[PDB]
Design an enzyme around this catalytic site. Structure first.
Site, mmCIF file in Angstrom:
data_model
loop_
_atom_site.group_PDB
_atom_site.id
_atom_site.type_symbol
_atom_site.label_atom_id
_atom_site.label_comp_id
_atom_site.label_asym_id
_atom_site.label_seq_id
_atom_site.Cartn_x
_atom_site.Cartn_y
_atom_site.Cartn_z
ATOM 1 N N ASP A 279 -1.216 8.824 -1.561
ATOM 2 C CA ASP A 279 -1.137 9.954 -2.477
ATOM 3 C C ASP A 279 -2.067 11.005 -1.871
ATOM 4 O OD1 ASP A 279 -1.863 11.885 -4.889
ATOM 5 O OD2 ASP A 279 -2.188 10.113 -6.159
ATOM 6 N N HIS B 197 -7.521 -0.525 -5.375
ATOM 7 C CA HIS B 197 -7.372 -0.162 -3.977
ATOM 8 C C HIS B 197 -8.309 0.988 -3.616
ATOM 9 C CE1 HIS B 197 -3.480 -2.292 -2.678
ATOM 10 N NE2 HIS B 197 -3.869 -2.884 -3.807
ATOM 11 N N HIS C 52 0.857 -1.182 0.000
ATOM 12 C CA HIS C 52 0.000 0.000 0.000
ATOM 13 C C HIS C 52 0.884 1.220 0.000
ATOM 14 C CE1 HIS C 52 -3.602 -2.337 0.738
ATOM 15 N NE2 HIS C 52 -2.927 -3.018 1.706
ATOM 16 N N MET D 93 -9.824 2.623 -0.041
ATOM 17 C CA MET D 93 -8.621 3.259 0.426
ATOM 18 C C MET D 93 -8.584 4.696 -0.057
ATOM 19 S SD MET D 93 -5.616 0.457 0.697
ATOM 20 C CE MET D 93 -4.760 1.440 1.896
ATOM 21 N N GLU E 99 -29.052 24.407 -5.102
ATOM 22 C CA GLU E 99 -29.920 23.281 -4.797
ATOM 23 C C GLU E 99 -29.125 21.983 -4.753
ATOM 24 O OE1 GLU E 99 -33.047 22.320 -8.012
ATOM 25 O OE2 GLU E 99 -31.773 23.614 -9.272
ATOM 26 N N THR E 100 -28.299 21.771 -5.774
ATOM 27 C CA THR E 100 -27.498 20.563 -5.923
ATOM 28 C C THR E 100 -26.144 21.031 -6.429
ATOM 29 O OG1 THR E 100 -29.502 19.335 -6.504
ATOM 30 C CG2 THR E 100 -27.403 18.430 -7.314
ATOM 31 N N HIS F 199 -5.563 9.056 -1.237
ATOM 32 C CA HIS F 199 -5.924 7.687 -1.526
ATOM 33 C C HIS F 199 -4.667 6.842 -1.767
ATOM 34 C CE1 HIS F 199 -5.177 8.079 -5.962
ATOM 35 N NE2 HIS F 199 -5.757 9.256 -5.861
ATOM 36 N N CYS F 200 -4.853 5.529 -1.686
ATOM 37 C CA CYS F 200 -3.769 4.606 -2.025
ATOM 38 C C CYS F 200 -3.615 4.581 -3.540
ATOM 39 C CB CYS F 200 -4.133 3.263 -1.439
ATOM 40 S SG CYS F 200 -2.848 2.016 -1.615
ATOM 41 N N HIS G 35 -27.980 13.269 -6.013
ATOM 42 C CA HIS G 35 -29.253 13.415 -6.699
ATOM 43 C C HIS G 35 -29.287 12.712 -8.048
ATOM 44 C CE1 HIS G 35 -33.255 15.006 -7.403
ATOM 45 N NE2 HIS G 35 -33.250 15.610 -6.246
ATOM 46 N N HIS H 192 -3.684 14.614 -2.631
ATOM 47 C CA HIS H 192 -3.901 15.602 -3.688
ATOM 48 C C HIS H 192 -3.524 17.005 -3.221
ATOM 49 C CE1 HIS H 192 -7.123 13.269 -6.242
ATOM 50 N NE2 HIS H 192 -6.017 12.543 -6.091
ATOM 51 N N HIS I 37 -27.023 16.906 -2.550
ATOM 52 C CA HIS I 37 -28.248 17.660 -2.383
ATOM 53 C C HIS I 37 -28.762 17.429 -0.975
ATOM 54 C CE1 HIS I 37 -32.170 19.453 -3.411
ATOM 55 N NE2 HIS I 37 -32.646 18.470 -2.748
HETATM 56 CU CU LIG Z 1 -3.740 0.094 -0.901
HETATM 57 CU CU LIG Z 2 -34.890 16.403 -5.289
HETATM 58 CU CU LIG Z 3 -5.670 10.826 -7.132
#
Ligand SMILES: [Cu+2]
Ligand SMILES: [Cu+2]
Ligand SMILES: [Cu+2]
Ligand SMILES: OC[C@H]1O[C@@](CO)(O[C@H]2O[C@H](CO)[C@@H](O)[C@H](O)[C@H]2O)[C@@H](O)[C@@H]1O
Ligand SMILES: OC[C@H]1O[C@@](CO)(O[C@H]2O[C@H](CO)[C@@H](O)[C@H](O)[C@H]2O)[C@@H](O)[C@@H]1O
Ligand SMILES: OC[C@H]1O[C@@](CO)(O[C@H]2O[C@H](CO)[C@@H](O)[C@H](O)[C@H]2O)[C@@H](O)[C@@H]1O
Ligand SMILES: O=N[O-]
Ligand SMILES: O=N[O-]
Ligand SMILES: O=N[O-]
Ligand SMILES: O=N[O-]
Ligand SMILES: O=N[O-]
Ligand SMILES: O=N[O-]
Ligand SMILES: [Cu+2]
Ligand SMILES: [Cu+2]
Ligand SMILES: [Cu+2]
Lengths: 334, 334, 334
Positions: free
Chosen positions: C90, C138, C87, C143, C272-273, C127-128, C299, C92, C248
């Site tokens: 990373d 993964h 494993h 992960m 709204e969304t 994330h892995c 939604h 971001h 939403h």
């Molecule tokens: Cu992993």
């Molecule tokens: Cu709705």
């Molecule tokens: Cu990424």
């Protein structure tokens, strides 16, 4: 009747972009481009899967065209007699006649000349659109590219500061639909026409078999990795003519991003991942801070790793331990 | 206890919109609307495929409701005894009680009256939401529409300039899930209840059989094309209650676009394609510059051309050769 | 060589978030976190379907890490010998070395220590990403998590007004791919390695079997509903490491939303969304105006109701009849 200076452009194959100025003291000109359609069977993966491609200038994506706001863009589209189908061109940057498509339909053996005024700044898709069910089929067969319309003063950050790039790359992402036979192997076909029935059945189920940059799995890796140096500001133009994408620079960021691709809007800053709506182009600039390899992906990681949508950058320069450091290398747990 | 003037609205079927003011000198009122639910078997394509639709006021989408910020919206929802299922209404523009859904559940033979204050400007979805697995099924069966809450001073560009439209159209996009039998033909059903088991199995695989505007393939083409004239500023409200869409005006642009649909935010300018997130409405205005036919599509071109999601505009006026011209008609290659 | 104060953080399981300051008068520090990888078979639905999960700290999503701009984040990643696979991690939010992934690959029985400088504000995925086809597997096995990098002055509305939240929740959305056998029942597996072949085949078709919040259908309902009171400003951080989502709040709104998740950009208002691009985190704040139950969903209502992606909020306080009222309860039609 239109008496402006004429300038010819020699287009280059993606991911490179023909030479151009950012900020310019030129006034409007008639900028002349030629696109020659090629239908051709190509290999799209490292297993040797073949695909009936249809292309502008022999490449997927078609080349990036670069002009400035208020230029007139005069394109000669050529459909050689060695092709089998009619073709045309629709520019999302243009106004009227279905983007030019209603004025550019040409059979094998014909050519046409269209001029449009670049009244809208940004990056824009262009694609073939012959009519009806042919429209999606020609686009997903590879007949799409982009055009960049720059402000005459170059790019800015929306707070009055110029943004100048040191280099620009065009990454065209293509969703491909290759049918399989009963045993589960990809099918090969002798002509685009022969691939049509099976390809359309698959297309309407909306799941691509491959998602690639620059026309093939691994196109922008190895010898053909993208490059930069620490300190360089790189503009990445990304287009997707049919399906959404979510670009991400692994180990970097989008320092300035126009995700809807239109320079009348200020860029957003400091993004991790951005979104290219199907039928559009967008652009992201990043100043590299660290050397090493970066991957540029769509961040559906299944598409990126398993379906083909991964490019690399190889970056030269000095490592910055302030930004990142391995404090302790892998070791046995105490 | 709430003593404001009352105003009745006569709703009209999409894509048209009931008469309204943009900027108004009226103060708040209680605006009264009536929606009558109709369950009905309809034809959704030119091949004669049928579908068990559930609708507000007999249409897909339900009609556009237009009010101003600070109005009170009083809706009478009616579920006639000729229907088979309970229904309700959820307004994304409203605050509390699941958008009104927790206060409006009605069996066949009942009606209910809900009032909500329009405190948030923009375009918003409304839809049925009875509970549990019924929620997606009623929505994808057609039970959704939109409501537009305008600022009292009308729309603006976020730089202090008014944006007034000459006309407004409402395009409701519907993802539909019609199962097929073993031979590969679409199934027909005698009731919504009978369609439920097969329809839910298909729904959970997330791929629609049809994506349509105004309830049917070709609804907004031919006699029922949208219209404009050169020089007219047209607002297009677009909603999608369940699934993303990427609107595009082929041969035009979005001059001013609220893609998240909310007028407290400035519009973006000069877009090629915009993005309507599933569960939302958005709005785009465009001033037509050229006559002729335009297509308005979602720019997944497979959906547009092959699954039903294409509308036309027929535009009258004078062609502008400065913006676009065919320099040389199709001719044999030298 | 880096001589700043050190601060340890005790991470807590989502949807809760470890204690932190919004605006701070602390200067930069080295903030120390520990993540211990656990591979484990878990139940993901109320029917008892099992899944081969891979997790940071035993949870899906991994815990939310909170720091301020200019802090240094020092993570000890631990891969106990009871796990079967290598494993890594990373971030971001980090710059260089594939987000840290190229510096953190550890076999079962090893640990590693990475430090990165938090130069970019916002919420970010971690994330892995071990390499190649393992990367998506993964991630979709669980992960992934998020890290929030706050401005030192706290959040603002982009018009100079502070935005302070009364509480923050982290909702991690996970697309899961559980294969079925011939009879149509979900398969169970004895190890992640054994689940790999069937799981990858399904993954490449891009349709999840389940979409859940906090690792399981119904995780954030009942006893484990999210809570608030009328008048409270709640920040909801939402992440999706692989696939788009459209959050939403049913019966509410996003009063201030960073849908691309990055605090250098002003929030949008009154949504709204909103849209979380796969591979990103975003954040929305809402001040509750009404008591009662709210649902927080993606939604795509099929995903929400049928595939697992629904959370509840239970809100205490006084009902506001000005905002919404049942004028007439359900009654027989006249
Ligand atoms: Cu992993
Ligand atoms: Cu709705
Ligand atoms: Cu990424
Ligand atoms: O980045 C575009 C964005 O910046 C603003 C200033 O906030 O305008 C700048 O860019 C315009 C287009 O290039 C120039 O015309 C203008 O002079 C310059 O200030 C915004 O108005 C625009 O949305
Ligand atoms: O277009 C909305 C956008 O414009 C601004 C000014 O940049 O505010 C304008 O619109 C508001 C909402 O209609 C008006 O209240 C305001 O008076 C007007 O300036 C922005 O604040 C807003 O985001
Ligand atoms: O909300 C971020 C947005 O607000 C502006 C002012 O419009 O800048 C504010 O926030 C910055 C980042 O926190 C502060 O540095 C700045 O001092 C404050 O005015 C925008 O520039 C920014 O995009
Ligand atoms: O063998 N073709 O399906
Ligand atoms: O490699 N062991 O510390
Ligand atoms: O014949 N029905 O599947
Ligand atoms: O039509 N030939 O020039
Ligand atoms: O029984 N397994 O497909
Ligand atoms: O319940 N009938 O009015
Ligand atoms: Cu073509
Ligand atoms: Cu197009
Ligand atoms: Cu209903």
């Amino acid at each position: 009747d239109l008496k402006l200076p004429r300038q010819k452009v020699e287009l280059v194959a993606p991911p490179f972009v023909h030479a151009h100025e950012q900020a310019t003291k030129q006034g409007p000109k008639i900028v002349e481009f030629k696109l020659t359609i090629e239908e051709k069977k190509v290999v799209i993966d490292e297993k040797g899967t073949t695909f009936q491609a249809m292309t502008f200038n022999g490449s997927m994506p078609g080349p990036l065209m670069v002009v400035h706001e208020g230029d007139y863009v005069e394109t000669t589209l050529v459909n050689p007699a060695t092709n089998t189908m009619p073709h045309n061109i629709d520019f999302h940057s243009a106004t009227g006649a279905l983007g030019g498509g209603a004025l550019t339909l040409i059979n094998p053996g014909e050519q046409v000349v269209l001029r449009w005024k670049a009244t809208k700044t940004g990056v824009f898709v262009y694609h073939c659109a012959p009519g009806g069910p042919m429209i999606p089929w020609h686009v997903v067969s590879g007949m799409n590219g982009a055009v960049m319309v720059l402000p005459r003063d170059g790019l800015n950050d929306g707070k009055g500061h110029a943004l100048k790039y040191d280099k620009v790359y065009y990454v065209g992402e293509q969703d491909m639909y290759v049918p399989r036979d009963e045993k589960g192997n990809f099918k090969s076909y002798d002509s685009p026409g022969e691939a049509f029935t099976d390809t359309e059945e698959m297309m309407k189920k909306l799941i691509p078999s491959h998602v690639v940059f620059n026309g093939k799995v691994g196109a922008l890796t190895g010898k053909n990795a993208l490059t930069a140096n620490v300190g360089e500001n790189v503009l990445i133009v990304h287009s997707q003519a049919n399906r959404d994408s979510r670009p991400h620079l692994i180990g970097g960021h989008g320092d300035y991003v126009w995700e809807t691709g239109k320079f009348g809007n200020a860029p957003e800053v400091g993004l991790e991942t951005w979104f290219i709506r199907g039928g559009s182009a967008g652009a992201a600039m990043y100043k590299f801070m660290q050397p090493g390899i970066y991957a540029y992906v769509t961040h559906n990681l299944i598409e990126a790793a398993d379906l083909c949508a991964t490019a690399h950058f190889k970056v030269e320069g000095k490592w910055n331990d302030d930004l990142m450091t391995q404090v302790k290398a892998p070791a046995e747990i105490p």
